[PDB]
Amino acid sequence: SLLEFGKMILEETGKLAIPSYSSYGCYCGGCGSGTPKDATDRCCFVHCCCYGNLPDCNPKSDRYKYKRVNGAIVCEKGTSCENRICECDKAAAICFRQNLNTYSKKYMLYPDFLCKGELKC
């Protein structure tokens, strides 16, 4: 659920999910269409695509448990949806941590019309 994901992001990047990653680029938050603007935005594109492989699950509201084993993120045993949702979130957090260097405030609150809608997952 958004609760776990937002906490995972804070621990990793030090930034708060909202408003740092809630409305960034074309795919972070109201991800929908367009060409990802940068690395961080690609992180969200792939994340959105990751949730897309789980049609009968509910990523926003289903809670899963996870632990830290010396900085490492470990998804604990839960239901299939919970295990797979955690794996998707875990990737995004690492992806975000990997592209902090190129995170640009220039992309916060990015306008809709500027998204050239075409990347198939």
Binding site: L2, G6, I18, S22
Partner: peptide, 5 residues
């Protein structure tokens, strides 16, 4: 905010 999208 914190707890969401």
């Amino acid at each position: 905010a914190l707890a969401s999208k």
